[PDB]
Structure formats: C-alpha cells, structure tokens
C-alpha cells in the first residue's frame, strides 16, 4: 500500500519504484534519466534509518516475465569492506545520499523488467527495500 513513485517517464524510458519495506517509504531520484544506460548515473535518496547500519548488505534481484533470472549480493558496510561515507549511522538517523551509482555492468538491462533491491544490516533486518519497474527502450 505504499505509493508508486515516478523516477522517469521519457519517450523510451520509464522507471518507477515502490518501497517494499512496510515500515516506511523513501525518496529517490535520478538527475538525468538517460544516464541509466551508461555505466554511471547520479542519484538522490533520502530515508529514515529504522535500523543501525554498522553493517549493510544489498541484495539485488532482476525479475523478467515473473521469473527471477538474476540474484546478486554485495556488502556495502562492514569490517574492511565499507563503501558509503554514511556507514556507521545509528538507528533513527536521517540518511541522505547524492552521488553516482557506478557499475561494473556498462548499462542496466534493456526493455521491461523489475529490480527488487533490498538492503539489510548486521542482524539481517530490513533497512530499505524497493521494487523498481523498468521499461528501457533508450539504447534503441
């Protein structure tokens, strides 16, 4: 029941998200939509941390035609593996990020899919969770 937010709606590009964390919504935006088809784009994101992020792990699933075709896990904070200046934020802090997502992938996939992006912490608790809806026909 969280609202679906429009990140992009361009001629050949739509991106939407919805928070799948029942506790809260969050705010997300891409400075230039069409940079999602390069290997780096600049984002703005804000949310309230309900949990500490001493440790932070992203799990990223890609779902196509209802089927989870890819699953990927990265540590973002941790002992010796910290990737975000706002690692260490205690419970109750207002997280902010504006900065690039870089990318070992040279571009997000083409066409119609969903990316579920779930962040969790030292205790496996859900910090943030998004279903992103992508329709990407730009590289066309």
Calpha distance 129→28 (Å, rounded)? 12
Q: What residue spans of 4-121 are helical by DSSP H?
A: none
**DSSP annotation of 78:** S
Q: Where are the domains of the chain?
A: 1-140
Calpha distance 108→38 (Å, rounded)? 8
Helix (H, G, I), strand (E, B) or coil at 91: coil
- Experimental technique, in short, is X-ray
Q: In terms of Cα–Cα distance, which of 129, 92, 137 is closest to 111?
A: 137
Calpha distance 134→7 (Å, rounded)? 10
With 0-12 / 13-18 / 19 or more C-beta atoms within 10 angstroms meaning exposed / middle / buried, residue 104 is exposed
**What CATH class does 1-140 carry?**
mainly beta
Decide if 19 contacts 2 (C-beta within 8 A): yes
Q: Which residues contact 81 (CB under 8 A, 6 or more apart)?
A: 75
Kindly provide the resolution of this structure in angstroms, with one decimal.
Answer: 2.4
């Amino acid at each position: 029941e969280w609202p679906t937010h429009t990140v992009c709606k361009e001629e050949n590009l739509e991106i939407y998200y919805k928070s799948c964390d029942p506790q809260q919504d969050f705010a997300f935006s891409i400075d230039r939509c069409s940079d999602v088809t390069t290997h780096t784009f600049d984002i703005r994101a804000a949310m309230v941390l309900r949990q500490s992020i001493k440790e932070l792990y992203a799990k990223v699933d890609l779902i196509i035609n209802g089927k989870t075709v890819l699953s990927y896990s990265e540590t973002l904070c941790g002992p010796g593996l910290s990737k975000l200046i706002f690692c260490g934020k205690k419970k109750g802090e207002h997280l902010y990020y504006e900065g690039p997502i870089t990318l070992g992938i040279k571009e997000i996939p083409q066409r119609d899919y969903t990316i579920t992006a779930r962040l969790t912490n030292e205790d496996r608790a859900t910090v943030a969770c998004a279903d992103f809806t992508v329709k990407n026909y730009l590289d066309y």
